[PDB]
Design a protein around this ligand. Structure first.
Ligand SMILES: [Cl-]
Ligand SMILES: [Cl-]
Ligand SMILES: [Cl-]
Ligand SMILES: [Cl-]
Ligand SMILES: [Cl-]
Ligand SMILES: [Zn+2]
Ligand SMILES: [Zn+2]
Lengths: 333, 334
């Protein structure tokens, strides 16, 4: 039933189509704009990494280990596995008296083609540090170590870290997080399906502080402001999240999830954004978060023009010929 | 009409993502055997119709003149991984026509297969036109021109006699109208022509059976389909669905992927052609859909059926090797 949110053209015709859902919620919980089904439970995957970084800050670990915005950004990141990402994750772990062996996420090659070419040339195999979640896992291990909680088995459903993350994420989103909503993430931690409406509300609360206690309100500001200050560390070279946060420095928060999830926030407008490409395609979610953010910057021509470049992405073939476009539909008007 | 949900992607107890699409199954006589969703709206077959495009290579007399075997015919029909074996053979086909990589007008790209791109990164500064998944098809085009003494320069162009011939061939096989209105530019810079899945399926069924084809075309069609089943590594390569699906039932199943979630298939002993499209263009959806479609025809061949159903319902494991959910064709296929 979800509307067609993205078209992919070739010649004079639409070659492929994507359906999806978009929730835009203010800090008080009012729905500002919606497309399609924002009530059915959806897996946020990596899109809610900023929510999961709150124990790192709220525990006092970030302060105890003298982390700045680059380590905060990396803990909120789906990074490319570039040398800067690896080194920082290694550094975050070392400051907690730990190494790569403490990571329980496993290893993978970069999903970014140019970075995988760099990795393939310089490595026999990637390590846990090269995992896009290695920053988030580093932050988890630091959160544990700072409070003298054994980080071994931190991925486990009833490890006190995962108990803390449920409690935090239920408070932010007002969603029920439990066994029936639970799945295993690519990094072997729990991911909880919840309505896009609730996920949007969670990010609006972090962005605005509305309904949050002072410590949580402050920790949420530090994380959102870190990602916007150090956008390379959230993603990296050639990535949409990094480029989208260089359009309007310090003003727009975005984060991708696996399976075509995007979360975003505009703290100055007090709004949180969540969305899902029903088929899970990254290119669709990317076109959709751009067209959605653009609705709020129509009277800022240069920002609007920069966002609309991601909402209407040209495709060139191997000879650099324009063959067609990836275009958000009129539903974003 | 809305296309039905053909593939679900699960995580824990829930459907995380879903795909819609369409399937046409047509016999040699043009009778519809099975269909899902919209099989009348024009769809770009992209690489899925490479075997139809290989007909000038055979029918011209070029394949025989240059002593091409099943491996060369398979490669001409291929979206290959850009492995050393594919590169060497594409180089060999060009060599026999008195040409080299500089004759190719497809451009260069890194392997879309992760393991092979790693090999390529470690062995190359940059790929060449030979590394292009379409280098075999383009080698065949150039070979077809060179044999008939037609200047291969500009063979990608709409009114080059090669592209005029491909149009005439594909219109005769499919019964579809191929013109500028239905034309787009493919990833390799040649024309790709949108046509109904029903017509694409009918096309492959005529190649598979020879029904309504003149003897020359019927024989070239047989040679190409038999070559791809004989040498499935040269159609795709290491770790690829097309190669593995054509090792389930050797000599019996023809499959070919197209960009944007197209699949074509054929079971010549059953007289059927298959075409399908994941509406969102996902590869994983088109793969689950072609396997679930083929499986309907092998329900009394338990070992073939179980091998196809492994692709119809593919498990997903995370970086630690933990089963997280499945990619499953829906009950519309059973
Ligand atoms: Cl993930
Ligand atoms: Cl709170
Ligand atoms: Cl292509
Ligand atoms: Cl293309
Ligand atoms: Cl004919
Ligand atoms: Zn993760
Ligand atoms: Zn091609």
């Amino acid at each position: 039933t979800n509307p067609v949110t993205v078209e992919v053209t070739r010649g004079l015709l639409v070659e492929s189509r994507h359906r999806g859902a978009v929730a835009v919620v203010d800090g008080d919980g009012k729905l500002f704009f919606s497309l399609g089904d924002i009530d059915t439970a959806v897996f946020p995957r990596s899109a809610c990494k900023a929510m999961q970084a709150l124990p790192l800050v709220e525990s006092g670990a970030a302060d105890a280990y003298g982390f700045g915005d680059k380590e905060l950004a990396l803990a909120c990141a789906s990074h490319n596995g570039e040398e800067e990402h690896v080194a920082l994750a290694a550094s975050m772990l070392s400051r907690a008296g730990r190494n790569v062996e403490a990571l329980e996420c496993g290893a993978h090659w970069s999903m970014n083609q140019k970075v995988l070419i760099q990795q393939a040339r310089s490595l026999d195999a990637p390590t846990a540090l090269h995992n896009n979640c290695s920053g988030k896992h580093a932050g988890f291990i630091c959160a544990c170590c700072h409070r003298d909680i054994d980080p071994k088995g931190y991925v486990g459903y009833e490890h006190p870290l995962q108990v803390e993350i449920r409690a935090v994420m239920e408070r932010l989103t007002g969603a029920v997080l439990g066994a029936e909503s639970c799945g295993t993430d690519g990094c072997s931690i729990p991911t909880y399906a919840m309505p896009l409406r609730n996920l949007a509300h969670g990010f609006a609360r972090m962005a605005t502080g509305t309904g949050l206690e002072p410590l949580r309100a402050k920790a949420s500001r530090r994380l959102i402001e870190a990602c916007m200050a150090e956008p390379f560390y959230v993603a990296g070279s050639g990535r949409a999240c990094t480029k989208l946060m260089q359009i309007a420095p310090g003003r727009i928060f975005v984060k991708t999830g696996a399976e075509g999830v995007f979360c975003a926030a505009i703290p100055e407008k007090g709004i949180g954004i969540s969305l899902k490409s029903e088929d899970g395609a990254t290119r669709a979610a990317e076109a959709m978060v751009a067209a959605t953010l653009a609705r709020f910057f129509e009277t800022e021509e240069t920002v609007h023009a920069a966002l609309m470049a991601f909402a209407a992405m040209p495709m060139r073939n191997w000879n650099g010929i324009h063959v067609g476009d990836i275009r958000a539909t009129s539903v974003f008007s």
